[PDB]
Symmetry: D2
């Protein structure tokens, strides 16, 4: 005989699965008692999380609102229509000129569907090279020729790079490359580029070689919504994004695409209109995905409502101000930030002049409750032992930190990188040797203690710190 | 000035976003006051949903446990390790012989990653034709030559079919086709095939043509874990699955793959071992996906713990018994079931002897709170007006229904299709004619009420019905 | 110092290069002192050979007549124009309905250009399976899955097969395969198919699945021109051919293509016209080839004039009558011919009932100055050790042989195969054993001498036997 | 009844086809009464033409010597073995370190076969851009993105370019491109590059990106054999060539490839040997070609014997000296030669400083019995109305012309380009206007008369002028 429904189906997680409950509680503590500096991370709201964790997960709704492959979607259709309208509203787009698909499971699924919509297999793409700051899905293959992203396997990639001495995109070399290589699609936006984008120039290059132009604004989408960085929609045909980075929503993707009359082009027929909508929609489903994750879509609708608030614009300005204040602190100590600063939410920090790799700094930081990620920098031949570390402001800004707080974060990072170098100098560069300095290191314990003291001063979205299992 | 953290970040959904709150509440009522017969749907536990809606959503954790691209993953690593271990445990797999990747965002991402791991672009694949019961992602292009799934775009697909008379897989024709086409990969498992699979014969065919053999058990994975249907692991190299269908977990995908020594095969060196693990992991990340959805992985860990329990085996047994009891009832009313019954959780109902298409039935059912999906059957060209309806037992079985209750479901469907016919007979076969009959039809309203009365008799997992915003 | 022009440039081959001169004389004797039965070989005229060895070899003439990439093509243009017009005249084609490109270097270049003109890489093609009698370039990969022809590498091939009972094309299986596989191009015509083609049925199949229909008439092109076999032009979009087989010209290829209004088709604009010409021309040059071989084109113009003569119709009738007479003679001795006879210039002889493979027969025959080729038959998994031999009538018919002479050839082959049996019986079935019977075998020497005595009874085109260097 | 063999088969071309005979005679007069300056043309020997027009055309010989798919190849095998050995001897190659395939039908088939041997579809290649001097088959697509050569369709091409100011290959930019694009194959050699090649630098670049290195020596093959330009064999993996340009043979191609021990490289095993042979042979047949053209192979063996003689080295020296003397003359008149001279057999003449396109010079020259070809120059978008004209020395040097004779050719060209200018000034630049200036032009008739008088002074290889039909 079956269990009663209530026993398996209505009993709380803390009773059904104490192990997973306990680990989530440990993760909750970790999230609010360290300094979380991964530039792609945020702390989303409790309201988002309540939508995310809901009966919306139970629904199959393949297709489009009002034209589904399954019955029962009366309310799912309203949620998805609301999410789409809030997505357009959040970025101040007119529905006559822009549509959006909110079904991508994540950012990488959003980009692959966008590419599948407008490209045939082996069509040519160019995006920012990963060590220059571009994303995996922008066509990444290594300088040794190893195809890493499937966007370099199913499509033909030729990346463009930053200037090797300034760290800024070399728009002249971008243009010359696009004219030689003749891409069908040029991708802009990136994962570790600390400056804004001259989308107008990208449009000029795309028009000179007849390419489509797509912006992936995943990292800065919240800053775009808040009108705090350049808008890609003014110049790009398609804009993809994640929703969980600076937009501060659930993990999901969106694809924005132009609709309606095309701008005037020579030879182009009169009355020409954009043709993205049906192809984008079809590429997401049925080409690539299956059932939408409606709990993500519902949670995303919440997040887009929250991103369209006056409070969110001030958040986005604070993120930029915090990144700049951090950047100034680090550069004052002599740390090598790419481009010597930032115009967005992140800094990219070249550790090679110190004789360090990013994995060592990431590991030492981790032991002090400082959460970063190692990161490739220009000319790197390793991702797991790269020459850089990347620091972002969104997550801690979401806990309310301001510029002086991010100067203190800079001080903690200076202490952490100093300690990293000291350990390497005393114990050596090999990881087996370096790891010996990570044990019973009083300076690690001091820095960890200072970090948690600091972290505990601030509020925390998403859950009630007062109610967590693991207390101070 | 920024908003206080608590206002945007800790306030409940019901206050932050009353529209989305209200829409979720309406969907909760719909789920527990209708008859939910989509074969791919289930009702998952509250405990799963609590892990799904949690701070795990905030974490970036690309890579493998213990070897990540980001700091801060000490607990996320334990959660993913626990999830992988429980996945092996739930299917009684020896870790020396099988591994599993639990990062796929959903079923379609799991399949595309499995394909990408073992196939080059344009390599040949054979799966069950969609009108014969196979899935979109098994290489679906239409009988008109339209490439629908991206599996038929990036790879070269040729489907195998069921016998056009019996509805069973024609294993002789499968073999002839495999030796002609010479696929690199043969896929078994399906979405609407009401019978079990002779995996041993699939292995014999794969071995004769030199193909890899992959089973997609998405639909029956819960039945497989409970050992209530044939096990694909006995004969398949790779097993993909979703976790939200009969497995009753969150929406996610899993890829199982063989490890360790290869079985004796002539022309193969001694001491040869499987090489799937690294290709599978790399295909999931960094080839295709980005950050894992750790809230999904934690929720999946809960579901896998729930699936290994003795109560789950009783559940899987009951799902099968309910499907059989419903099939016997419908056949007793003279309806046409593909293969004349079922061996799993679903029945496939051919409506063409009745002069109906499944969109008519799905819509009529929908206005009566009977949630089904139209379904292609053999020879169909239209997906949006196909010849069949698919009915599955997992979701209502999870509410505690047994065989006599599924006989009542059978009578409700019999009433539903009878009324669909009368609407057609009275108003017309052209959809615009037929749709006249769906306006203030007292017989629809009566059937809808009766369905609600029946549904209200049963418990409901995932949320407390006594607590929902909308009652009677 | 520069040699004087006359010493290197005007001295006859016999003086400049006695080795090659001598080898050519040895080959000349071989050609008129053996029985030459390779079905794709012919003996072309001295007039063709005089054009072939001419100053036309010196000219670069890329492009089209009157629109070349080089100067000096006044006369090359008239030659190519004359060749094209003669090609249309030889097949009784209306220039308003058919065009022809005569630049392909050989048959395989002609086919690859035709495919390149109308297909993208990886588009699907269906041709007759090589063991069923199809050609390499029709998409050959082996029953072991090895891609042999580039047509199966750059395109996606799936062959259709003969019925194993009758040896004829199975047209219902062809249709079913075409409807399953959905080729963009269906190829008909073959290399070892001894029967005619139902081009009308091929057209019905191609129309049903939306495919282009190409006939490769290389082997029977001379019989087509003489209206002695079915005309592919009645039903095919494109007809490719070599010119050195039954057409009895130089080695070259030709692509014929439809021009002008398309036939009425529901699902086709009015006034729709064929669009092959420019694609076919462009695929030949500049896509694939370089400079035309103008000596070949001149020689081809000669051959096309000869093919359009009353004597050539009598020759084509004789080729067919000789093939039938040979087939009946062999079949009267108890041998197995695929399909039980022939309707064209060749017979396909299945040696497996005798316990023989074609290499053994081919090698024994070769030692006896009987020139055949081993040939795959239905079921074969080896090309260098296949189960059949192919025999053709064009070359010996061109020396003037008539039916009674081909009955004598039949008796020579009967002696050859009988001796092959006796060697195998005496020495063994393994090749290392069998080859011991080929050394100092008086019976081979006797058969060789009898073959030469018979062969010397007949005239010989292309050169004068009375003037060859190596006399009897 | 059939015609007698003698009537159709042994009768001379003059009787069988007076039309083709007459047209060939007209071409013969044109070849020895004008100035033939197409850099890719030559006048081959009578001995070559006698082998070309021989019974060798009748033989099918698919396969390799001693391992054929047909009987009867005793003498064809000896001819092909001899050709290959003479090919290695002509280029001073040790058979232990180099092999050659002499079956390619022409230059473009040779290159496509070499590519097919070592590349998969869509693998990356880099060749000299066509306007910079590279060949079509080196991956040519236009600056507008139109794929012209199939080598840019079946493979992924990114050309390298000359320095726009100097006309010389920019080896630094080649290296940067190669490191960014990561080609599998780098091609060197070209069609209109007037300088020698730094094969060492190409090898350094190929090694830095892990590419194969192929040289297409078609144009300068004869200069390479005579050791009068740099040898590509010192540094290249594969060397392809035509045989009809400076090598002065029939129209055919060859593919040379390394054999035996590989050069030392860390990571490469000891005892590593090259593996090109089987792949190259297989790519030629059975992958791409069908039956070898044995008359071309036999003719090629003759040409290779002639090329290995002492007079040929003097010929190759004279070719280079004549091209230089011609170049100096044109520059002395103020004309603009790409790179301001030549190190090989050709000059590339930029007409754009004159306000002329090459088609006008080609047409006017053609009316004056001066055979040139228009040629793309750097930055050209048009090939039929390009910016340049290309002049080569091989053909007229073969008639015995020396430097003073090529200075008169320079004067004839000066007169011709002067005349082209006068006509364009008088009648206009639109083709319809310019062409009317080509009628009743006394300066054209005077220059034509002078050209014929000059041309009649010289001997002529390949046929006896004293014997032609159209005497002067
Ligand atoms: N119907 C029909 N269609 C045609 O197109 C033709 C025809 N008849 N007759 C004449 C001619 C045959 N041309 C062919 C036919 C097939 C193949 C072909 O399949 N070649 C593979 C296998 C070769 C093989 O058999 N190897 C041994 C082992 C010993 C060893 O490999 O040395 C083994 O595997 O047993 C390879 O090269 O790998 C190559 C050339 N031809 C067109 O020209
Ligand atoms: C066999 C099979 N495989 C994969 C999937 C894809 O799962 P996602 O939707 O998570 O991408 C499905 C979904 N089938 C849904 C249905 O049959 O209604 C499936 O049936
Ligand atoms: C520009 C960009 N685009 C797309 C993605 C993909 O999102 P998913 O991980 O959801 O697939 C990322 C993730 N970048 C993660 C990081 O920069 O740390 C990104 O930076
Ligand atoms: C470098 C090069 N390679 C290959 C070829 C092709 O040869 P075929 O034409 O035989 O295919 C050419 C011909 N180039 C002709 C010219 O430069 O005028 C060539 O110049
Ligand atoms: C039908 C067919 N098509 C094309 C070709 C190719 O012709 P080339 O060899 O000129 O490339 C052949 C050659 N078949 C050779 C044989 O049957 O013996 C052929 O049989």
């Amino acid at each position: 005989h079956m269990d009663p429904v209530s026993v398996w189906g209505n009993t709380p997680l803390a009773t059904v699965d104490p192990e997973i409950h306990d680990l989530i509680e440990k993760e909750k503590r970790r999230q609010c008692r360290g300094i979380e500096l991964i530039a792609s991370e945020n702390f989303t709201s409790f309201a988002v999380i309540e939508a995310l964790g809901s009966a919306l997960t139970n629904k199959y709704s393949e297709g489009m609102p009002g034209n589904r492959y399954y019955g029962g979607n009366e309310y799912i259709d309203q949620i998805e229509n609301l999410c789409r309208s809030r997505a357009l509203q959040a970025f101040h787009l007119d529905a006559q000129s822009w549509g959006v698909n909110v079904q991508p499971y994540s950012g990488s699924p959003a980009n692959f569907a966008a590419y599948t919509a407008v490209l045939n297999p082996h069509d040519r793409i160019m995006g920012l090279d990963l060590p220059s700051g571009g994303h995996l899905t922008h066509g990444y293959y290594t300088s040794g020729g190893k195809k890493i992203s499937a966007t370099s396997i199913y499509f033909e990639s030729l990346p463009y790079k930053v200037n090797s001495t300034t760290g800024y995109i070399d728009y002249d070399r971008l243009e010359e490359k696009a004219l030689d290589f003749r891409p069908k699609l040029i991708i802009c936006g990136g994962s570790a580029y600390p400056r804004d984008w001259d989308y107008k120039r990208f449009r000029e290059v795309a028009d000179k070689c007849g390419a489509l132009l797509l912006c992936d604004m995943a990292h800065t989408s919240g800053l775009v919504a808040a009108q705090e960085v350049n808008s890609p929609f003014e110049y790009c045909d398609i804009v993809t994004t994640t929703t969980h980075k600076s937009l501060r929503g659930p993990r999901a993707g969106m694809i924005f695409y132009r609709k309606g009359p095309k701008p005037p082009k020579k030879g182009q027929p009169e009355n020409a209109v954009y043709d993205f909508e049906d192809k984008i929609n079809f590429a997401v489903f049925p080409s690539l995905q299956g059932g939408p994750h409606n709990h993500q879509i519902g949670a995303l609708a919440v997040a887009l409502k929250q991103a369209a608030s006056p409070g969110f614009k001030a958040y986005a300005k604070q993120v930029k101000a915090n990144a700049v204040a951090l950047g100034k602190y680090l550069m004052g100590k002599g740390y090598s930030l790419v481009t010597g600063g930032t115009e967005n939410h992140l800094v990219l920090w070249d550790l090679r002049p110190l004789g360090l790799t990013g994995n060592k700094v990431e590991k030492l930081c981790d032991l002090c409750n400082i959460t970063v990620n190692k990161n490739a920098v220009f000319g790197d031949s390793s991702a797991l032992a790269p020459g850089g570390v990347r620091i972002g402001a969104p997550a801690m800004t979401s806990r309310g930190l301001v510029e002086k707080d991010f100067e203190q974060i800079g001080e903690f990072l200076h202490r952490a990188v100093t300690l990293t170098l000291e350990i390497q100098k005393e114990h050596g560069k090999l990881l087996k040797d370096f790891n010996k300095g990570l044990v019973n290191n009083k300076a690690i314990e001091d820095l960890k203690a200072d970090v948690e003291k600091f972290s505990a001063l601030f509020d925390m979205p998403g859950f009630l710190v007062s109610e967590m299992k693991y207390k101070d």
